[PDB]
Amino acid sequence: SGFRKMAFPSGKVEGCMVQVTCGTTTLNGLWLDDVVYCPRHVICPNYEDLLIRKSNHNFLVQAGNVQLRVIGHSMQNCVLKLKVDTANPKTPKYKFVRIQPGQTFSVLACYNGSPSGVYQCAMRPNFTIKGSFLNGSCGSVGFNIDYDCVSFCYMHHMELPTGVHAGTDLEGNFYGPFVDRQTAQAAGTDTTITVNVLAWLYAAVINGDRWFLNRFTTTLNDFNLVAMKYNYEPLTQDHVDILGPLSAQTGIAVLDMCASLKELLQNGMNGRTILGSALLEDEFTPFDVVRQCSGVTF
Amino acid sequence: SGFRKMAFPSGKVEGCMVQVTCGTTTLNGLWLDDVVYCPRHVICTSEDMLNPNYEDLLIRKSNHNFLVQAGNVQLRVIGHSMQNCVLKLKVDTANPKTPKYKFVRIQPGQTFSVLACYNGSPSGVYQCAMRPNFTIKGSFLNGSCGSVGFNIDYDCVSFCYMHHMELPTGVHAGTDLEGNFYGPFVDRQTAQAAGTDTTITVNVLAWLYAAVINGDRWFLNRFTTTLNDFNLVAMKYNYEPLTQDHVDILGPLSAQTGIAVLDMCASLKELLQNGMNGRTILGSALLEDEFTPFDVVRQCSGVTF
Numbered sequence A: 001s002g003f004r005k006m007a008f009p010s011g012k013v014e015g016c017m018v019q020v021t022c023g024t025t026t027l028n029g030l031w032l033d034d035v036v037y038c039p040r041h042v043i044c045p046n047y048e049d050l051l052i053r054k055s056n057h058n059f060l061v062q063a064g065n066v067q068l069r070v071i072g073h074s075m076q077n078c079v080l081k082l083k084v085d086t087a088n089p090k091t092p093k094y095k096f097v098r099i100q101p102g103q104t105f106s107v108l109a110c111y112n113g114s115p116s117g118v119y120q121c122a123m124r125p126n127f128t129i130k131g132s133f134l135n136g137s138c139g140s141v142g143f144n145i146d147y148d149c150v151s152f153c154y155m156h157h158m159e160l161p162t163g164v165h166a167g168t169d170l171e172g173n174f175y176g177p178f179v180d181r182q183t184a185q186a187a188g189t190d191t192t193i194t195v196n197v198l199a200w201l202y203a204a205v206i207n208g209d210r211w212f213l214n215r216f217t218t219t220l221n222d223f224n225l226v227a228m229k230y231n232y233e234p235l236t237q238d239h240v241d242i243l244g245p246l247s248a249q250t251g252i253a254v255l256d257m258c259a260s261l262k263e264l265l266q267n268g269m270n271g272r273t274i275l276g277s278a279l280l281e282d283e284f285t286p287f288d289v290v291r292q293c294s295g296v297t298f
Numbered sequence B: 001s002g003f004r005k006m007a008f009p010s011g012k013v014e015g016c017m018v019q020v021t022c023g024t025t026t027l028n029g030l031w032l033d034d035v036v037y038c039p040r041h042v043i044c045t046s047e048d049m050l051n052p053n054y055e056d057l058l059i060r061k062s063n064h065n066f067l068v069q070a071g072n073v074q075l076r077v078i079g080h081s082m083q084n085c086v087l088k089l090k091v092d093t094a095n096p097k098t099p100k101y102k103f104v105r106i107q108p109g110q111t112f113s114v115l116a117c118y119n120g121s122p123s124g125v126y127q128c129a130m131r132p133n134f135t136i137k138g139s140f141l142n143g144s145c146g147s148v149g150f151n152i153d154y155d156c157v158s159f160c161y162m163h164h165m166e167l168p169t170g171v172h173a174g175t176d177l178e179g180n181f182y183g184p185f186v187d188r189q190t191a192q193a194a195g196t197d198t199t200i201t202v203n204v205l206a207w208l209y210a211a212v213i214n215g216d217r218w219f220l221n222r223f224t225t226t227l228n229d230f231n232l233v234a235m236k237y238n239y240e241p242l243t244q245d246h247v248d249i250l251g252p253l254s255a256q257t258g259i260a261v262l263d264m265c266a267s268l269k270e271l272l273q274n275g276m277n278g279r280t281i282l283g284s285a286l287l288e289d290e291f292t293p294f295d296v297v298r299q300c301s302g303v304t305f
C-alpha cells in the first residue's frame, strides 16, 4: 500500500553530470562517452557567429575534481556538443528520446556539476514543466529508465515569468514555442491531462478508495463535451485502449470511470480526499500506475 | 521558482543494495564495508511471526544458510550477529562502492528519502516524513523489507530508516540502522495499530514561509497570537503542539521574509478556520506538513519574491 510521486533511481545519471564554464557563465553538462552536452546559451544572439569566436580552451569542463580537456566543439540546434579527451567510464546504456505532452520523467536537479535533488514531473500540454529550479540549474536533465537503458528526454534551459520551466530534448529542439533568448515569452493556457487523472483514479481504487464510484456510464463523445468545458484534454480511443489493463484489474470500465470523473468535475469532492489529495492529480501516467502497483526494478 | 517534493540523489545508496535469502524468505540488505544489514525477520516463517523467539531461531542457523547476492555475484557469509531487530551478516568482500556514511536516529517531523527495492534491485525513490505517531506513509509492496531511508547533506549519507512492516491501515513501520523500532511496534504478527496521527505544525509553518518566498501572501492577516492561544486552537484541529524550540528553528525564515513566527501562526489559525476558498498554496489545496524548516532553506532561494 501507499501511493507516492516516485522518481527513477538517479545513480546512472549522477555519474554523467559535469560543470561547464565559459567566461562568466557557469552551468551543467551531460558527459556521455567523449562528448559533453549543454545549453548553447553558455556562450552568451547569433550563436554561430558567437561560437566561431571561441576556442576549445575557452570552455572549462570539470568532472568532480578533474578538469576535462575540450578538443572540439559543435552546435546541434540549441545544444552545444563539447568533444573532450576522456571518455566517461561511468557512461550507461542510453538513448535520446523526444517525449509527448502528458508523459512523465525524472529530473536530476544540479548546480555546479553536482546533483542536489531528484523529482518526478510531467511535460504539460502547454509544453512547459512545473519544476523546481534556481539560477545555475541550466543543463539539468530529465530521464526515464527502461530496464537498464537510460532514456534522456529533457535538458533545462530557462524559467518563464510565471515560474514554470522550458527546455529541449537532447538533440537541442525545444518543447513548445520557445526560443533561447531574453525576450517576451509566456506559457500558453494549460489544460489537465485527462488520461493521467483517470489512471490516478484507478490507482485510488487499487489502494481501497471507491467513494467516487457510481453505477453510471457515458459515451466518449458526451465525456469529451463535458471535459472540454473544464479545460481537460480530449480523451481519445488510444487513451481508452491504454487504460485497458487497469480497467480489467479493477473491474471498472474506462467509460464507467469517466462518469465518476464527470461527477467529480461537476460536484467537487465535498470535503473528501483521494489518495491524500483534495485536487484531481494528473502527473501519473497509466504506465506509472502499473509500475508502482507491481514493483518493477532497475 | 517552483516547489517540489524533492528526494536526495539515490546513487550512493543504490551501490549498497543487495538481496538476502534465508530458506523461503527473500528481502533487501544494506552492504556497507564487509557487513550486510537486514531485518532479523528474514529468519522467520509466516507461522513463527506470531510469537517468534529470534535468539532460538538464530542459534539454529549457520553462515551458509544465508544467501547474499550483489548484482550477479554471490557474496560469502563468514559471520552473523543480531543487534536489536537487525541482523548483521559479516561477508568476505568489502563493498568498493561504500560511501562516507553514518547511522542517525531521527525524531518525528523529520524528513528523508526512501529508495524502495525488491530483490536487491532499486525500483524507485521518494521523499517522506516520520509521522508524530512514528509511522511513515510510504509506498511499499511485499518484498520491499530492508529498503532504506536516508539524507545526503553535503557528501555523507546518513542512514535513518530500514523498512520492516506494513500496518493494517496501509502505513509503514521500521527501525533505525541499529535495529531499534520507531514507535511502540514489534517485529511480530500481533494486533498492532498506528496511534492517532497529528499534523506536523512546525513543517506547515515552514511551507507557508516557502510560499511567501515564492511570492504568495494571500493567506497573511493583520493579527498576531500568543504561543499558548495558538496551541489551544491547533490542538482542536489535530495539530502537534508548537514548542519554543520550533519558534527558534523558524527564526531564519522569519528574518528572511520579515514575518514574525507568531504572525505566521495567526495566519495558520485563520487558514484552519476558513479553509482555502478555491485557492491553492504552492499548487496544493491542502496544508502540507512534509517539508521541514531545513528543507525549505535548502530548496528555496535566499531572495524573497
Ligand SMILES: O=C(Cc1cccc(Cl)c1)Nn1cnc2ccccc21
Binding pocket: A041, A133, A134, A135, A136, A137, A138, A157, A158, A159, A160, A179, A180, A181, A182, A183, B001
Ligand atoms: O532563464 C534563465 C536565463 C535565460 C534567459 C534568457 C534565455 C534563456 Cl534560454 C535563459 N535562467 N534560469 C533557468 N532556470 C532558472 C530558474 C530560476 C531563475 C533563473 C533560471
Ligand SMILES: O=C(Cc1cccc(Cl)c1)Nn1cnc2ccccc21
Binding pocket: A001, B041, B049, B140, B141, B142, B143, B144, B145, B164, B165, B166, B186, B187, B188, B189
Ligand atoms: O508486513 C510485512 C511482513 C511482516 C509481518 C509482520 C511483522 C513484520 Cl516485522 C513483517 N511485509 N511487508 C512490508 N511492507 C509491505 C507492504 C505490503 C505487503 C507486505 C509488506
Ligand SMILES: [Cl-]
Binding pocket: B105, B106, B107, B110
Ligand atoms: Cl531529527
